[PDB]
Assembly symmetry: C2
């Protein structure tokens, strides 16, 4: 048998990331397969969230939310126009028809 010849066939400990992000260990201590499985999920997730995020961020900033106030204002305007009509039509009724103004007990 080889003179001792310890079976130290450890794979390349190329893990040189002397960094300790809370999940770094767990990330290295996980099996590459799993990390990959979560990549297909997390990656596709971020990918899908990129499509949305792109739009979302562009839309949101370009979004507000006031159409109901608008509507109330349009309804209000149609309401004021109601009075405008009532008042102008009367003003006109005094103005348009000369020498005609409703013969009220003016004199």
């Amino acid at each position: 048998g080889a003179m001792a010849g310890d079976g130290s066939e450890f794979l390349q400990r190329d893990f040189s990331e002397t960094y300790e992000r809370y999940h770094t260990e767990s990330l290295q201590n996980m099996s590459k397969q799993e990390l990959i499985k979560e990549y297909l999920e997390l990656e596709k997730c971020l990918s899908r969230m990129e499509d949305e995020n792109n739009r979302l961020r562009l839309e949101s900033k370009r979004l507000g939310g006031d159409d109901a106030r608008v509507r109330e204002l349009e309804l209000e305007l149609d309401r004021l126009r109601a009075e405008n009509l009532q008042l102008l039509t009367e003003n006109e009724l005094h103005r348009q028809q000369e020498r005609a103004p409703l013969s009220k007990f003016g004199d």
Copy 2:
């Protein structure tokens, strides 16, 4: 020397992911360190994008964008109120002061 023995000390090929997502190979063919490095980025990215996505999605849907239409309508209303004032004030000028209406050439 050992009777051939062969150095077949290959690590456990526990890569049972018999799946071929376009990046699966490349994902396994990358070094775990790198996959981890991109996790710290992609993960924190998705983390940040989760915070925003959450709000964004909640906000966007609950957002619109009409305040300027609103404003135009408020300006419009103030405008109509301008007339309402002009017309009501005149209607009143005919109504309020009895036996007083501007002695126009009515008679």
